[PDB]
Design a protein around this ligand. Sequence first.
Ligand SMILES: NC(=O)c1ccc[n+]([C@@H]2O[C@H](COP(=O)([O-])OP(=O)(O)OC[C@H]3O[C@@H](n4cnc5c(N)ncnc54)[C@H](O)[C@@H]3O)[C@@H](O)[C@H]2O)c1
Ligand SMILES: NC(=O)c1ccc[n+]([C@@H]2O[C@H](COP(=O)([O-])OP(=O)(O)OC[C@H]3O[C@@H](n4cnc5c(N)ncnc54)[C@H](O)[C@@H]3O)[C@@H](O)[C@H]2O)c1
Lengths: 544, 546
Amino acid sequence: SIRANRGTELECLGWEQEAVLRMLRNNLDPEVAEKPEDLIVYGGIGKAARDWDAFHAIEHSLKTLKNDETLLVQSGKPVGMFRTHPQAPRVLLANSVLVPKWADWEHFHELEKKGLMMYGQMTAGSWIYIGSQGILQGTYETFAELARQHFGGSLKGTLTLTAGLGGMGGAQPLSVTMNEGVVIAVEVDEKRIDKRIETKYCDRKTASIEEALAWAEEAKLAGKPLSIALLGNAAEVHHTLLNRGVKIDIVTDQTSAHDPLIGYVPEGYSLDEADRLRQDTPELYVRLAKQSMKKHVEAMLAFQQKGSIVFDYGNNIRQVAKDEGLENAFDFPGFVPAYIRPLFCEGKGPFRWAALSGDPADIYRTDALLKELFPTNKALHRWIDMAQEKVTFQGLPSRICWLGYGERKKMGLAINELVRTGELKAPVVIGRDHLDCGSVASPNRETEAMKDGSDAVGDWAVLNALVNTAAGASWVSFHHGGGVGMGYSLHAGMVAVADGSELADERLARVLTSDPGMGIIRHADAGYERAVEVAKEQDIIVPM
Amino acid sequence: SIRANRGTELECLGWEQEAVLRMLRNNLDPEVAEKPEDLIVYGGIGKAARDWDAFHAIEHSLKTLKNDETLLVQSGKPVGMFRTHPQAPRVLLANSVLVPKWADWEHFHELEKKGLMMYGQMTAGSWIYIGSQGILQGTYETFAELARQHFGGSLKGTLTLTAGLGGMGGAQPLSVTMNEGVVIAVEVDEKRIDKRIETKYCDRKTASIEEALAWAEEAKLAGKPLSIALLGNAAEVHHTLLNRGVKIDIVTDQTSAHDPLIGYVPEGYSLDEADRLRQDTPELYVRLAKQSMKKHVEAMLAFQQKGSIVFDYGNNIRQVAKDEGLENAFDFPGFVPAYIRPLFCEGKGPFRWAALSGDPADIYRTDALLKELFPTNKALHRWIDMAQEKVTFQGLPSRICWLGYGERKKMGLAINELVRTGELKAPVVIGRDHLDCGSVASPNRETEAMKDGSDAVGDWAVLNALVNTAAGASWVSFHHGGGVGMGYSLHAGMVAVADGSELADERLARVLTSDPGMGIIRHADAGYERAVEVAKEQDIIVPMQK
Ligand SMILES: NC(=O)c1ccc[n+]([C@@H]2O[C@H](COP(=O)([O-])OP(=O)(O)OC[C@H]3O[C@@H](n4cnc5c(N)ncnc54)[C@H](O)[C@@H]3O)[C@@H](O)[C@H]2O)c1
Ligand SMILES: NC(=O)c1ccc[n+]([C@@H]2O[C@H](COP(=O)([O-])OP(=O)(O)OC[C@H]3O[C@@H](n4cnc5c(N)ncnc54)[C@H](O)[C@@H]3O)[C@@H](O)[C@H]2O)c1
């Protein structure tokens, strides 16, 4: 049982290096991770380190790492260490990167068996995962925007259908609930449902569809919010609800479709049976899993034709159905081009922070800070109040709060000031998911249907990592295949520590500017007016 | 026509930024580039900037760029500029990167015509190209090691057959010749042949196969070295040489097979006809080009089966043949696993430097410098002597000289010392090709047949770019598809400026250690014994070790 150290006592030579060690450990905290005993944090086999030997080597390196040194991590394995500068990142990570022609699961697995690979997902291998909260606001905003577009600005009296109650998928129920809606989420592993119930991310659970629908109608009628976890296999249940004529307003999905071998259970198999299918006949498992997802998607399309609003929530499931012959698998859009992109054009993203002290008092303090720095932003305050009331901390106390260009720097510098004066009991790590305004290229998700068709351009993601290393981040990462699977994405991550020092003030101002700035210029280059405007408004250099 | 500024006069706010401006221009110097009117430096369409407008914007940005600022270049286009630190790179570049599933020439061309793409090759888009000399020692060393392996340690008395006399391929003739051998290099464009001849990278030329064979035979007997450029199409010429029973000792190739649309002329078409075929029916063109490259490779396999030593010289030709149906296209090895890999295990690679002064005297001075710093190293002295004797400068006087781990830092700090005292008349840029011991991932070339089977792992190339940025290089780049084409490689470049300042001494010591250091830890991780030895000898940290 691994968990981040608490307090002000260090195990490393400096706070910046201790921050890495604590966040690495926090990623594997039983309250945080989905299956830490196997180093799995979330999203299928998204791991924190290659294996246990690698894990322990990183810990040792981190404790002896000097203030002007940089540790190199290659797919969860510490592979080198060189002298740099106090302003350079303490750690540099490159996880799951494969030459394009070999960027598929088949080759990944071949390298994995040889002990040469690890799947870092986005925040799993870059140590900045904060439990189900990380994606919460992202999922909340997506549904909130969908609400304003089709239901008058609220999901009150509407029923949402989805599946997948894992680390990140588990945030779907609370997201719909916070928007005042009713939701039924299908999950095939009761253990997963319990995790969501225990952590307050889902209200109820049931194994019978009849009971689920009765609760949903009752809540929809009384116009009250309600989350219901339905035990079953979505590929099957969705068709049952479909052929029963149930009225479903919104349909999406978040099973780990990006990984046919691990993330999706084939219809007709119990978990035990599926486990054996997976172990004994892996290739059979995949063929059957793919067939199930094709069927799962046919059901989503049927709902869309029936009138419900349907969208892909970034698990690449549409691609899987497409690959099986479903020519119209992409008849419904991805949540980014449909609901979130405008937020990116303002430099907004899943910006977040964690209190190394371990004391929630620090998070509450940063929460009040937000209101002090942005007194006129009603929505921001509404979000913080919801967060404080409905989110239960996991591992080190943390906060998800989408801030845009400028707002990030301002918050980061303020946080560092409170760490220095002591209002914040210990240093705080500032980070984000790799899904952000200027850190990722992913044709089936974040960069789906860019107005200029630059969907596949991966230069920006690479530039994001390069500039943030130059700007002075604490640890920078470059991953491949996060979210959508092998061959479908390239993205970067950035974490900077606010230890209260003057050095941090310098680095924070720089990197908290470059990171979101990157997002503004990428969208300005694509021709998004709001982004072009933000550039002029906050003096973001756009050469041409 | 464009060329690098010369002298101590500055157009930028500092020498580091000035260095960028001059290497950028030097890349398009008529003396250096293959087709600078279209921003083309070498290797098919490897360019220096997306288009002319992008080029001029870069210049303007470079002239106002401050000592603690960083310009961002995306596929040859300046897209942003942020405040960083004096030790952070002045320019960060990401060229040609495409999400894997879309990393093919079809999607590249689609984006390119929309003005959304540029092929950076390796040193074209990262402004560190120095004419044909850049790859010269690499090619010399390849043939040198091959000689030791199959011909007693010399090519004297052997005949090599190859093709491709472009910017990089043009170094083949001289490379064989420097090994005392005889070579016939087939080139379909006479203007390309004249270019090699004028730059002294090739001895003679002829459009007569008969004449060529007679010159080679005469020389192979007299035991004299001789390079012959043969006007023609390899697809056809090689089969003629094969079917007439010519005795050929070594066969390789260096046409631009990595780019079917631009780099290979289909058999049976004049250059003028191929241009129209290419503009009008690009898809048909590619089909015909691939058809011809298959025939070309079938001839190479025939020579091998006939007893000649054959090898792929990094243009991905084997792949193009394989994709066409030649099931045994990979019957001959790539030069890296066969001849160069041991060098990478020493952290060696196409290390290079250029004199921003524009005065060859600075280079001759660095040539003497090398000997002073490594007075015991006979091999190093011999190479530098050959280069200074056989290499005619192009654009800013520059020197290619392979240095391994440790040696790079020593030479770099020494050079900086000479810039400080004034013996060197101006700052010098220290760089290299993206092909190096720890900067690239390329299953069909640099990482072909890694002993642990880690061929396709691309993490190290990324880490290379990342570490050098942290180390304090002047400009770092990360490209996709260099050398072998779209989808086949990921790699990083690194350039550092020795301007005589103390800031440079510190940055130089840091980055000239990390760059080659990465090469050592990558091969050691793969299990290469010499690499593990060098790590122990130099105390290079390998975290998994207790
Ligand atoms: N859009 C985003 O912002 C975002 C962010 C993070 C992760 N993701 C993606 O979301 C997906 C889920 O991530 P996660 O961390 O929750 O994954 P996870 O691996 O932790 O959980 C996946 C869940 O899918 C369930 N499942 C598999 N087959 C099923 C079936 N047939 N019916 C019902 N449930 C089934 C599993 O039992 C499990 O609980 C992944 O594809 C991931 O990459 C998206
Ligand atoms: N192994 C290495 O260290 C290394 C280094 C740099 C470049 N390269 C590769 O070498 C190749 C050539 O590079 P370059 O800069 O010389 O390219 P280039 O585009 O400048 O020149 C290619 C030459 O091929 C010729 N050609 C095309 N079809 C021909 C035919 N049928 N017969 C004879 N000649 C023909 C062209 O006329 C041209 O002169 C590329 O594939 C490049 O990526 C390898």
